[PDB]
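Notebook p. 47: complex prediction with nickel (II) ion.
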Amino acid sequence: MSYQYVNVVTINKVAVIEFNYGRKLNALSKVFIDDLMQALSDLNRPEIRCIILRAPSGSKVFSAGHDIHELDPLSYDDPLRQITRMIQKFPKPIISMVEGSVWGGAFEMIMSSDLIIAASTSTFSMTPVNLGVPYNLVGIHNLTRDAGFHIVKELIFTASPITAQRALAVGILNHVVEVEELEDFTLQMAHHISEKAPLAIAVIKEELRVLGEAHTMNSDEFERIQGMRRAVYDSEDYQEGMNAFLEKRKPNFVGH
Amino acid sequence: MSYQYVNVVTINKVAVIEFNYGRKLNALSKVFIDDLMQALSDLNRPEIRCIILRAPSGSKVFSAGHDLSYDDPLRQITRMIQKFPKPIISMVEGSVWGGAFEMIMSSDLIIAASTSTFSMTPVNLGVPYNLVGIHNLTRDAGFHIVKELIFTASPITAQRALAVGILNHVVEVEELEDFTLQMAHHISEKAPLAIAVIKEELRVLGEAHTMNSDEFERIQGMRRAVYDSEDYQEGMNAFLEKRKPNFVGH
Amino acid sequence: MSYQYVNVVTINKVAVIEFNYGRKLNALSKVFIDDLMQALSDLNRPEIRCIILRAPSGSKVFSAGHDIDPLSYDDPLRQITRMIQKFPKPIISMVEGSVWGGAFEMIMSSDLIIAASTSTFSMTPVNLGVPYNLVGIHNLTRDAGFHIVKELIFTASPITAQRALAVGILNHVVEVEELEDFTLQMAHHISEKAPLAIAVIKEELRVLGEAHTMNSDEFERIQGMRRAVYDSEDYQEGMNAFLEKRKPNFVGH
Ligand code: NI
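Predicted complex, structure tokens below:
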């Protein structure tokens, strides 16, 4: 019924899960993610038909992304890994209602959701290259189903932020609205969907999930990528990137 | 050479298949689809280079859709349209609904009137759409967009359809026919064999999302659960009974 | 380093590879491609972090594309697209002028595409009756949707830089006067990021992008069709018409 790190409300058949982790700017800490997951789980009932994920009204930062301090950081059972999986497999639609700036891991988190509705002032950025992190295959895969290849590559390689208007243009966002209408706009849609056949929505969603994951390869290729990842994890650049982050200074990458 | 449900006209290398089932709003009935398929088949000749599918001029409704086994009409037509060695352009005028949307999605190009509208509606009736069918709807617009389309069953405008990648071109209704024909004639000057093989290569790549038998069987199990649900009955009912369904999750 | 068909200049951590074959409109000749590949290869050093591919300033034609199974594993275009894709540094295609045929696939295979508001693009295999290969076709499907791709290929009609942007092919469109500066700045910016991270992600993206698999029978079946095209009358006609600079007359056989 209650959680330390999220606040939940139910409005008819729609449930809203609001973050309650502001000190860390909603960074994806284990305790935080665990509460989000418990909440979702608790909401997996016939009477609940649609979920909305959001940061508190007026938030400057929607989510800072991975919790560096807490630091292979992207292993199967890591929080971010677990949540994306859960969200994707959840039999009810999940809408990310965005207010504030979205960063790295949080960006992957919202991409994994079903729909994204955002304020005209929100911003988006994918940042593993800033810290020198060798992002995982599944993680990367999750960022390629909406905008095209070139676009995705620009986001990742530059780690530069994009406006909500651009995010809408490239296919990332569903709708962009004025912050004052965000909540209202999102709820209307949620209630609308909640009037539809839940069982059909569930199956279609899973069909989409399964098709979306269907980029297959042989074990040698996976092991080869994994070897590359290890090499990155073992590099100087990797240490340099984390420190600089922790040290709140510009990193000096050298290619080894 | 002649059909009950469709009218065909050939202009040099271009063939126009026009629906003739307005009384039923061009619903995807077996009879209708059977004629569509026959007409396509009859047009599979070296001298025909490009096909155009359309509803009669001035139509308010392009197709109402349904009236999902491997051999059901809709499944049959999408496969056929996809394997057809000639390009097939859907020239849309009017509102597009359900099965009809998948049908045009399965085609090579879609050119529509500035006033046309589109909706996928399986969630309105509680239908557990099939994997192949859903797959057919994921090659043009992004995942988040498709999910919105499908989950809301809300109509979108021709302008949004264009913006998200579903449509090739949107034009004033008065110019629709000519714009389409000109593009068709132009394609007809190109190498047909090359077009054919490239279309097929695209088709094969497009289907190349593979999975194991267990996954397939698992989805099949889920689908069956849907067809066996109360909600499913309620959905068919309400449609018939022309009333809003009351879904409950069982 | 030096090459006959391309020029190279390094600016800090960025390297610019410029085509030097205007006499032939930068057609994708073997000797041209070989040079490009060597230049990339020579640039595969820790101090180089980003690459820019471009045609000379002012070019009216970025690349005419193909020069007279020509699409075999070891053909130049086949080799260069693989190279570009496997290159552990980002490769940005900076476009000024018109882009044609193979050159279009070439830029598509790169990481980002930034172009002049006046540039244009056309996929032309259907003009000549060429049975494009699977890998080649695949390379053209990761940016714009299916319907759009099919229109480009089926019509072989050129599209504007504005439309290329709108359908997802291009990253940015800029006024020629600002093309260079805009491109360089981004490249410099990329150069400040973690190279190793970039390389692994790029390779992950490549592997995922190729991951549309099929059985041997399907592939052989495609090959058989391709071969039938190559053996057709229309194939001869397309090549001849092109040489004789006259409109081809295709018949379906
Ligand atoms: Ni795919």
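Notes: Residues A 215; B 209; C 212 surround nickel (II) ion (CB under 6 Å). Chain B touches chain C through 37 residues (CB under 8 Å).
Next step: compare against the earlier run before touching the bench.
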